[PDB]
Amino acid sequence: AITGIFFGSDTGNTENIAKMIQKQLGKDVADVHDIAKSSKEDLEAYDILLLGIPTWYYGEAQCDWDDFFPTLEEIDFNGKLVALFGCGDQEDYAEYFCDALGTIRDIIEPRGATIVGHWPTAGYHFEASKGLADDDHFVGLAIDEDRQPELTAERVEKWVKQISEELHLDEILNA
């Protein structure tokens, strides 16, 4: 498949988003992988990567992703298209809201990743986040199953539609 979805998850929320995204892109278009069982080679096997990472323990990367970080740093993302997604709690962790999105961005961006999927901070109620691209945009899709679960369906659909356009899955696959 042209797209490789790699995720990390402790309670299943980001695991579910990864599967919602694949279901929307079609399993023929996207492969789903748990970073916990993944290799450096798995990521290098795709030129379009969708990385899902929730934030835990006050601004930390999900443990499995944290374990993989030294390996991710060895990869060259120059020539690769990457979109980011992850979950967080904007009420209990208002000052660490989806920080991991910025942490992983800090790894793949300097290494060449062409990132697509920036998402507006509008509609969210948080105080601080390391996962911002600019003043009013997260660097990727921020999902909150604890405080705004009612908005997940709508959020995933538009973001997937959005990144398909930015990735041009229309042309790459058939045009």
Ligand X SMILES: Cc1cc2nc3c(=O)[nH]c(=O)nc-3n(C[C@H](O)[C@H](O)[C@H](O)COP(=O)(O)O)c2cc1C
Annotated binding-site residue numbers for FMN:
9-14, 55-59, 89, 93-98, 146
Q: Interacting stretch for Ca ion, rule CB under 5 A, among 40-48, 59-67, 85-93, 110-118?
A: 59-67
Work out whether 102 is an interface residue with its own copies (CB under 8 A): no
Q: Which of residues 11, 23, 47, 67 is near its own copies by CB under 8 A?
A: 67
Q: Which of residues 44-73 bind Na ion (CB under 5 A)?
A: 45, 66
Q: Which of residues 31, 60, 146, 166 is near its own copies by CB under 8 A?
A: 60
Residue 54 interacts with, from ligand X, Ca ion, its own copies, none (CB under 5-8 Å by kind): ligand X
Q: Interacting stretch for Cl ion, rule CB under 5 A, among 24-32, 100-108, 127-135, 138-146?
A: 100-108
Residue 63 interacts with, from its own copies, Na ion, ligand X, none (CB under 5-8 Å by kind): its own copies
Q: Which of residues 76-135 bind Ca ion (CB under 5 A)?
A: none
Residue 124: which of 83, 84, 152 has the closest Cα?
152
3-state SS of the chain?
CCEEEEECCCCCHHHHHHHHHHHHHCCCCEEEEEHHHCCHHHHHCCCEEEEECCEECCCEECHHHHHHHHHHCCCCCCCCEEEEEEECCCCCCCCCCCHHHHHHHHHHCCCCCEECCCEECCCCCCCCCCCEEECCEECCEEECCCCCHHHHHHHHHHHHHHHHHHHCHHHHHHC
Site residues, Na ion (CB under 5 A):
39, 42, 45, 66
